[PDB]
Amino acid sequence: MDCGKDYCVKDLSLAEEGWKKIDWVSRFMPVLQYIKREFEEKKPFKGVRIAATLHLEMKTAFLLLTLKAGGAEVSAAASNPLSTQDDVVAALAKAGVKVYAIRGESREQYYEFMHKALDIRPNIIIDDGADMISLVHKERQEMLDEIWGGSEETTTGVIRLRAMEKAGILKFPVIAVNDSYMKYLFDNRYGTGQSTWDGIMRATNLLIAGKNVVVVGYGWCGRGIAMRARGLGATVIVVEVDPIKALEARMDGFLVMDMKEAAKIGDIFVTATGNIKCIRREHFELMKDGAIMANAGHFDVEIWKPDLEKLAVEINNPRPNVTEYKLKDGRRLYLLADGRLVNLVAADGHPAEIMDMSFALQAKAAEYIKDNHERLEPKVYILPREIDEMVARIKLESMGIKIEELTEEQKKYLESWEHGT
Amino acid sequence: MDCGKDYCVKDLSLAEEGWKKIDWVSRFMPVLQYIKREFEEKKPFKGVRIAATLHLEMKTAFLLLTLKAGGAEVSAAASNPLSTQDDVVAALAKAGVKVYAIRGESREQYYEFMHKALDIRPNIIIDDGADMISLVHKERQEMLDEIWGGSEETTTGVIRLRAMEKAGILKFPVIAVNDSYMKYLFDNRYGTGQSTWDGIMRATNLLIAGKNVVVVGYGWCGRGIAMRARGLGATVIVVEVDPIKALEARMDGFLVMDMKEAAKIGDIFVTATGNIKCIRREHFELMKDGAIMANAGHFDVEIWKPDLEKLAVEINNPRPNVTEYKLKDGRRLYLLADGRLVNLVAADGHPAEIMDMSFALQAKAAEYIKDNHERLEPKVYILPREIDEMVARIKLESMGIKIEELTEEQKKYLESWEHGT
Amino acid sequence: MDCGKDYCVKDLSLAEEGWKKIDWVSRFMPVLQYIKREFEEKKPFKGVRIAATLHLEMKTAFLLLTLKAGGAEVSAAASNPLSTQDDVVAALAKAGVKVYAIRGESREQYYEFMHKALDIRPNIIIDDGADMISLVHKERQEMLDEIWGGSEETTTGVIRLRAMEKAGILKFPVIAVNDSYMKYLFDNRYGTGQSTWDGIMRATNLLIAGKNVVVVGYGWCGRGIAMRARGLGATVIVVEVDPIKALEARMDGFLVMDMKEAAKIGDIFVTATGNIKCIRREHFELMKDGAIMANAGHFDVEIWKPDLEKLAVEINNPRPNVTEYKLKDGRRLYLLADGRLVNLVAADGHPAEIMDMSFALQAKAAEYIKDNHERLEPKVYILPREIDEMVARIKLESMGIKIEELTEEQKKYLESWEHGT
Amino acid sequence: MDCGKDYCVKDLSLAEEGWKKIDWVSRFMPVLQYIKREFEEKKPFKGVRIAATLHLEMKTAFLLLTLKAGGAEVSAAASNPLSTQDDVVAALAKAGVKVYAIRGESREQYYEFMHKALDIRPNIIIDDGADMISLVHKERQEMLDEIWGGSEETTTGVIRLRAMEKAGILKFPVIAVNDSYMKYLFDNRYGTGQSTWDGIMRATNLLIAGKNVVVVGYGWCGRGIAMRARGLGATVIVVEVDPIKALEARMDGFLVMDMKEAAKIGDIFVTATGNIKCIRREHFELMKDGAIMANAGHFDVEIWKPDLEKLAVEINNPRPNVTEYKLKDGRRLYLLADGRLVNLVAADGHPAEIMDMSFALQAKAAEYIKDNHERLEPKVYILPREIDEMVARIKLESMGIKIEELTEEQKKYLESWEHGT
Ligand SMILES: NC(=O)c1ccc[n+]([C@@H]2O[C@H](COP(=O)([O-])OP(=O)(O)OC[C@H]3O[C@@H](n4cnc5c(N)ncnc54)[C@H](O)[C@@H]3O)[C@@H](O)[C@H]2O)c1
Ligand SMILES: NC(=O)c1ccc[n+]([C@@H]2O[C@H](COP(=O)([O-])OP(=O)(O)OC[C@H]3O[C@@H](n4cnc5c(N)ncnc54)[C@H](O)[C@@H]3O)[C@@H](O)[C@H]2O)c1
Ligand SMILES: NC(=O)c1ccc[n+]([C@@H]2O[C@H](COP(=O)([O-])OP(=O)(O)OC[C@H]3O[C@@H](n4cnc5c(N)ncnc54)[C@H](O)[C@@H]3O)[C@@H](O)[C@H]2O)c1
Ligand SMILES: NC(=O)c1ccc[n+]([C@@H]2O[C@H](COP(=O)([O-])OP(=O)(O)OC[C@H]3O[C@@H](n4cnc5c(N)ncnc54)[C@H](O)[C@@H]3O)[C@@H](O)[C@H]2O)c1
Ligand SMILES: O=c1[nH]cnc2c1ncn2[C@@H]1O[C@H](CO)[C@@H](O)[C@H]1O
Ligand SMILES: O=c1[nH]cnc2c1ncn2[C@@H]1O[C@H](CO)[C@@H](O)[C@H]1O
Ligand SMILES: O=c1[nH]cnc2c1ncn2[C@@H]1O[C@H](CO)[C@@H](O)[C@H]1O
Ligand SMILES: O=c1[nH]cnc2c1ncn2[C@@H]1O[C@H](CO)[C@@H](O)[C@H]1O
C-alpha cells in the first residue's frame, strides 16, 4: 500500500517492530559485525550500486544495512513470495534501501518487484536461487556491461548458473557463495537441520519423537535434517539416488529405501533434493491418513502439487501454512507452507549465528567482485579458501575458543616423505 | 472484555480461529478420540459438574469438550495467566464451557476467575498446579462436602497435595495423574524435551548447536530437555542436588557441575527443578554477556526475578517474550517468557500426541473419581496400572504397532524358582 | 588339575597373570577401595564365613579379597560354567579363597563345585542367579540355621527368590542387591550396554553400523543395549511384551515390532528378557543367512537352542564363541557364546567402574546381613536408600565432581503447600 | 622361525587356526567375494607379480588370496611389526603367498622382510604407509622399470607419495586408494570409529560412559572416533589446528580446546592426526593420574614416547598392550599398544564389512594399473568415480537395499537454467 519510486511495502508503520528484529539478531552476528566495522571505516562501496534477491527477514536486512554502511546504494526484491517479513521490509525502506516486497506476492508481482530492484542499474547482483541473474540475461540485457558480477547463495541457483555457463550464455562472472566450506558445511547442514524442524513444529504443534520421518535426499541439507530429526526422537528413513550417499545414511543408522516403499510408512516427509517431482501421484496414493509433507529445497517443485490437486476432492486450509488435500477414499494429506521452504515460510529461517557466517561470505564475495571483476571471465568461481579461514577464525575468537597451532617441526613433517618406520 | 455470568473472555469473535486450532490438534489425539466416542455413547458424566484449572490452549479445549460430550457441565479457569490462548477460550465459551480467562490477566483476575469457575459447585476438580484444590480448602470450604475428588496434572501440584495430606488438611481424595507411567515418562520427559526447545527457538531465532546449554534439574523434565538439547547439537551441562541423578547425567554423556561453575560458561540456562531460587543473584553476576535464561518448571520462582531487577540498571523488551536486564558493567542477560513455562508462554505447549496421552489419563481419572469416590479417603492416590496399560495399548493400535504377548509358558516360568542352570 | 580340599582350579601356575588382572582393575574401583580401607581397620567379618557364587573374573576376585581383608573366610563357585577366568581363579586360590571353578565346567561339575563352596558352612551367601540359595534349600538343609542371610546380584535371581518367598519355602532373609538404584540404573543399563557390544565385536569382528539390530526386551538391560547399538551406528528394532515399554522405545527413536516380523529383517539379535523361549523355531526359520544371535540374560534359555539343533543338518564352530547351525536350505545362523551371557563369555564382563558400584553394594549388603539378620524375616528386602546415596557420593568425589546442595529455604519450599501463584 | 626362500613365518603349524579366521571374515565380505568370482573366471592377473605391504590379519589375507585366485603371484610383508597375526600368515604361506612376517619382529627384520617380498620383482605394489614404495625408490632402483604402478591404502602414505611427486622423485604411477569416496568416508570414519574403541575396551576393560575423551584431530578418523566415543556415553573434547574443522566439532556438540587445556581434564586421549608430537612432554606433565593414551594414526610418533620415557622413574607392564609410565610425583600414565595403531595391535582391526569395501577398491586399483599403466605418468591418481559407484552398488544389493533412480526428466532439470519461480 505504501508503494512508490523508491520502495513498495505492505505498511510503513510496521517499521518500529522490524527495527527491533534487526537489532536483536545483529546482537548475535559477530562475524558480520566485524566486517561492518571495517566497511564503516573504509567505505569500500562508495559509489557502488547493489541489487539483491534474498529472503527478506531480519538477518538479510542486517546484511543489506552492512552493505549500505559500506557506502553502497542498495535495492532488494524477495527471493520467495512467502518468506518476506513485512515489518522488517518496512524498516529497510525507512533506512533508504530500495526494497520491493510484500509477503504473499503473486508470481507476477514477484517479477515486477524484481524488475524494480533492477532499475537501480547494479554493479553487483546478490542472488538466492539465480532468478535475478537469469532475469537480467533474458529480459534486461540493456544493463549487462554495467554489471561487474554476481554472487549466488544456494545450491539450486549454482546449478542453474553452471548450466548457463555450459550453454555459453552467462555474460558476467558469478561467485558460488554456496560452494564455500563455511557455507554448505554449516548453513546447508546445521542451519537447515535446526530451522526445518523449527518450522514444522511451529506450523503443526505435532510430536517428532516416535514418528517415521522420511528425508528425501542425503546431501548437505538432507543429512542435517535427518540428524536433527533423529535428535528429536524420530525414526529416520532416507531416500537417495546416489549409492554412496545411501550407504553413508545406512552407516549413520538410518533406514534406506526407495520412495514408493517410504511412502507407505512415513508420517512426515521432508524433501531436500533440489530436484523436480521427487514425490508425485503414486507416492501420495500410498501415504497414510494424516501424513505431513514439507519441502526444504529452494523451489516448490519437489513435492508435485498438481498431482495432489488432481487426487483431491476437497482442498482445505485448517491452519496457516497447512493445506489439506482430501482424497476420494477419505484420506487427508497435509502440505506445509504451500510446498515452499518450510524453515523460511513457517518460521524465521536459519538461526542468526548461521546466517552470520553465510552473509559474511556474501559481503566478502561482493567485495571480491568489486576488486577482481576485471580479471575474471564470464564463469562460475568459488571464493579462495583464505576467506573461509578468515570467517572461521573470527567466529572462533567470538566464542572464546583457542585452537592448537602447528609447530614448524610439524609443518616440515607433513611436507616430507622420508620419515617412515 | 466479553464477560457474562457464564464466561469471561477477551473477545468472542476470535472463536472461529479457536475452533480451527481445536479441530486441528484433535485429528492427532487418537486415545482421547477413542475415549470421546465411549463418553458420547454412554454419557457417564450426565448430571456431573466439573471445574478445571488447566493451560487453556487447543488440546486442553478438546479435553474439556470430551468431558462435556460425556454429559458433564464444565467450568474452566487459567492455570497460568500467560498460557491462555484467547481464540481457543472464545471457542470454548461458544461451546457452553463456563471459562473465565484472558491472556495476560492480573493476579487478582486469576483468583477472581478461579472463584467464578468454582461457582459451578463442582463434583470433580481437575487441577494443574494445585491452586484450585488449595483455593477450595482455604476460601470455599462451603462446598467441600459436594466434591467427590480432584485430580492433579503436574509434579509441583502433586508435591503440594501430598504435603496437605501429611498435614491433615486434605478433605477429599486426589488422583495424582502426574504419577502415572503414561504421564511422567512421556509428558514430563518427551513432551517437555521437545516443547521447551520449540519455545526457545521461537522466542530467540538462535542456534542451539555448539552452545553450552545448562540444564538445572535432571528429573523427568530435566533429562528430556537435556536429551533434546543434545539432539540439537548443544554441549549440555547438568546441575543437580541428587547424587544418583548427577551420576546418571554423567553416564548419559553430560558434564555435571554446580550452579556457580555452570553460570560462568552457560550460553542458555533452562531450569526444571520445581524448586525456588535455583538461579539467583550470585549466578547472574557470573554469567556471560547475552546469556539466555528460560524456565520449564510450573512456577516462575526457579529463576529469581527480583534479583535480576535489583541487579539491572535498565529493563528493556527487544522481542516478544524476551526481557533484557542490563547490568552496571554493560552485560545484558535475557529472560524468556518472563521466567514462566517457556513451552506454554512462548510456544504452543506440548505436542498434540503427548497431551493426548496425558489428557486421556485425566479423562479416565475423572471417570475413576465418579466411580470410586464413595470408597476413597482424603488421600493422594495413583491410577491403577491397568489404565496406564489401556492408554498405551490404544495408542499402539492407532500407530499400527503390534507387540508380542507373553505365552502361558513364559508367565509360569517368571513365577517359578526351580529352573536354574 | 590342581584340585584339593581347599580349592579346585585349572592351573596354579597361572596365578601371576591373574594377580596382574586383579591389580589392574582395582586401580579403577575407588568405591570398593574406600570400603576395603574401612574393612581392614575394623575387620567387621572376623570369624564370619562367606560363600559366593559370582562370575569369577578379576573384579569379582577384588570383591572377595575385600571381604577377606575384612576378616571373612571366603569360598567361591562359578555363576556360569563359561565366565570363569582360569588365571584369576588361580590367584584367588593362592590368596586363601576356597574357590572351586574351572572354565568350561560341565553342568555336573558346576554343582559339585557349588557344593564344595557350601562345605565352608557359610553365615552369608552371596549369589548371582540364585542357584546357591536354591541349592541350599533343596539339597543342603542341614545348614540353614547357620545361614544368617543371602544377597542376590541379578534380576533373574531376584525373580526366583521372590517366587520362593511366595511359596513359603524361603528360610532366611535375602537382600535384592539388583533392586538398588545404584545397581540396576548403572550395572543393568550402562554396564550391559557397553559390555554386550564389547563381547559381540570380540567374538565376530563384524560391523555394528548399518546393521539391523534386534533387541528383545526393553527393560534396564535392553534399553542399555539398544542405546549403545544406536551409538555404534545400528538401526535398532525393539521387541517387547509390555506396551508402556514399547511406547518408550518408540519415543526413543527405535522401531517396535513383534518377534516374527523382527526375525525376517534383523542382522544381529540380542536377548535381554530374563524369560524362556523368546526366540524359537519359527523365528530361526525366518532369519536371513548369516544372522548373528546373542543372549545377555542370565540363563541360556532365551534363545531356544534345541529348536536350532533340530533345524540344523550341520553344527560347526568356525570361531571360538561362535556356533554355526547350517539349515536344510543352506542358511547358516550363528549363535554366540553358546547362548550364554555374551559380555562375560566372549569378553571381560562389565567394565571395572561399573562392577565397582555393584560390588560395593554387595559388600554393604553382606555387612547389612551381619548387623540385621536377627531383625529380618525370611523375605526379600531392598537395601535402604542411604546406602545407594553413600555409594553415589563416594563415586562423585572420586571423579572430582561437586554438586549443588539444597538450601534450607528450598527444603522448606518443597515440603510446603501454600505457595501457589 | 620357519623361513625358506618362499616365506618366513613364526610357526607353520598355526595355519589351521588362520584358515578358520580367514574363512570366517570372508563370509561377510560380499563385494570382495563378487570380485573374486570374476577374477577366477577371467584370470586377469595371470603372469602378473604383486608385492604387498599391509596389516597381515584375516581380511588382508582374503584380499591376497583373491588376487592369487585371479592368477597373480603374490608376496607380502608387514605394514606394522605388531599388527601381524602369526596364525593368519601361517595359512598364507601354506596357500602359496610369499609372506615374510613375524609378530613382534624387530625394525631390522621389518626391512629385511620388505626386501624379501620385493625379491619377487613386482609389476604392481600395494602399500599401506608408503614404506615399500619409498624403499624401492631408495634401495631397489634396479626394478623401477619393471613396476607398472603402485597403490597406497592410507592417508599418511598418500601424503608421503604426493610429497615425492612434488619433489620429482616418484618414478612410476600411484593410485591413492585412500582418496576414493568408498574408502575415506567409510574405512577412515566408520571403521576407525568402531575399531578404535574395540581395541581400547579390549586392552583396558574400562568404562567409556562418563569419561572425558580427548580426540586429537577432527579429520575423517578423528570425527569417527569422536562420534562413537559419544555413542558410548563419553564427554568428547576435540583438539584441532584447522579452524573450519574446529567449528564443525563445536556444531557437532563437542567441546573444542587446545591440547594443554585438554591435557588437564582428559581421562582417555586418542590421537588421529597423522602428525608428529601432538602429545608431548608438557602435556604428560599436566595429565591426571591414570590417564589412558592411545594412537589411531599410522605411525607411532603422534604420542611422543621418548618424552614419557624421560619423565618416567619406572616403566611397568600391568596388562598386555598397557605400558605404565610412573612419574616422580607418583602419577601413572598408561600408553596402549605401545603408541601404535590401537585398533590393529590391541584388537582385530576394522570390521570385516569395512575392509571388504577398502580392499575391493585395492583389488580394482590393481586391475586399474594392469589395464592403464602404459598411459599413466609418474603421478598420484585417484580411481575414477565409476569404481566407487560400482563398489557401493554391489554392497547395496548384498544388503537387499534398492534405491531410487534419477528419471530422464530429473536429469534434464538438473542441467537447465530457465525453470525458476
Ligand atoms: N534454508 C534452506 O531451506 C536451504 C539451505 C541450503 C540449501 N537449500 C536448498 O536445498 C536443496 C539441496 O541443498 P544441498 O545443498 O543439500 O544439495 P546437495 O546436492 O548436497 O543434495 C542434493 C541431494 O539430493 C539427492 N537427490 C536428487 N534427486 C533425488 C531424488 N529424486 N530422490 C532422492 N534423492 C535425490 C542427490 O543425490 C543429492 O545427494 C537445494 O534446492 C538448495 O537450494 C535450502
Ligand atoms: N513445562 C511443562 O510443560 C512441564 C511438564 C511437566 C512438569 N513440569 C514442571 O517441571 C518441574 C519438574 O517436573 P519433574 O517431573 O521433572 O520433577 P522431578 O522431581 O522429576 O525433577 C526435579 C529435579 O530437580 C532437582 N532439583 C531440585 N532442586 C534443585 C536445585 N536447586 N538445583 C539442581 N537440581 C535441583 C531434583 O533433584 C529433581 O531431580 C515441576 O515443577 C513440574 O510441575 C512442567
Ligand atoms: N551382565 C549382564 O549380562 C546382565 C546384567 C544385569 C542383568 N542381566 C540379566 O538380564 C535379564 C534382564 O535384566 P533386566 O534388569 O533388564 O530385566 P527387566 O525385567 O528390566 O527387563 C526385562 C524385560 O523383558 C521383557 N520381556 C519378557 N519376556 C519378553 C518377550 N518374550 N519378548 C520381549 N520382551 C520380553 C519384559 O517386558 C521386561 O521389560 C535378566 O536375566 C538379568 O539377570 C544381565
Ligand atoms: N587406525 C586405522 O586403521 C586408520 C584408518 C585410516 C587412517 N589412519 C591414519 O590416521 C591418520 C589420519 O587419517 P585421516 O584420514 O583422519 O587424516 P585427515 O587429514 O583426515 O585428519 C587429520 C586431522 O588432524 C588434524 N591435525 C594435524 N595435526 C594436528 C595437531 N597437532 N593437533 C590437532 N589436530 C591436528 C588436521 O587438521 C586434520 O584435520 C593418518 O595417519 C592415517 O593414515 C588409520
Ligand atoms: O533467515 C534467512 N535469511 C536469509 N537467507 C536465509 C535464511 N535461512 C536460509 N537462508 C538461505 O536461503 C537459501 C535457500 O533459498 C539457503 O541457501 C540459505 O542460505
Ligand atoms: O499444550 C498443553 N496444554 C495443556 N497442558 C499442557 C500443555 N503442555 C504442557 N502441559 C502441562 O503443563 C503442566 C505444567 O504446569 C505439565 O504437567 C503438562 O502436562
Ligand atoms: O565382570 C563382571 N564380574 C562380576 N559380575 C559381573 C560382571 N559383569 C556383569 N556381572 C554381573 O552378572 C550378572 C548377571 O549374571 C549381572 O547382575 C551383573 O551385575
Ligand atoms: O583389519 C585390517 N586389515 C587390514 N588393514 C586394516 C585393518 N584395519 C585398518 N586397516 C587399514 O590400516 C590403515 C592404517 O595403516 C588404514 O588405511 C586402514 O584401511
Author numbering:
A (entry chain A), B (entry chain B), C (entry chain A), D (entry chain B): 1 to 421
Manuscript text:
S-Adenosyl-l-homocysteine hydrolase (SAHH) reversibly cleaves S-adenosyl-l-homocysteine, the product of S-adenosyl-l-methionine-dependent methylation reactions. The conversion of S-adenosyl-l-homocysteine into adenosine and l-homocysteine plays an important role in the regulation of the methyl cycle. SAHH depends on the cofactor nicotinamide adenine dinucleotide in its oxidised form (NAD+), which is self-regenerated during the catalytic cycle. The protein structure of SAHHs features three domains in a monomer, the active form is usually a homotetramer.
Crystal structures of SAHH originating from Pyrococcus furiosus in complex with SlH and inosine as ligands, show architectural flexibility in the active site and offer deeper insights into the binding mode of hypoxanthine-containing substrates. Regarding the structures of PfuSAHH and MmaSAHH with their preferred substrates inosine or SIH, the oxygen attached to C6 seems to form additional hydrogen bonds with the carbonyl oxygen atoms of Asp348 (PfuSAHH) or Asp362 (MmaSAHH) in the main chains. This suggests that the hypoxanthine ring is in the imino-hydroxy form, although inosine has been shown to be most stable in the amino-oxo form in water. In the inosine bound complex, His298 is situated within the active site staging a His-IN conformation (gate shut) where its imidazole ring is oriented towards the γ-carboxylate group of Asp128 with a distance of 4.2 Å. The Nδ1 group of His298 is oriented to the O5´ group of inosine with a distance of 2.7 Å. Similarly, our complexes of PfuSAHH and MmaSAHH with inosine and the complex of SacSAHH with adenosine show a closed conformation state of the molecular gate in their active site. To further investigate this observation, we used recombinant enzymes either previously preincubated at 95 °C or permanently handled at room temperature for crystallisation of the hyperthermophilic PfuSAHH in complex with inosine. Comparison of both structures showed no substantial differences in the conformation of the differently treated enzymes. The prediction analysis of PfuSAHH tetramers (both inosine and SIH complexes) showed an average value for the solvation free energy on formation of the assembly (ΔGint) of −129.0 kcal mol−1.
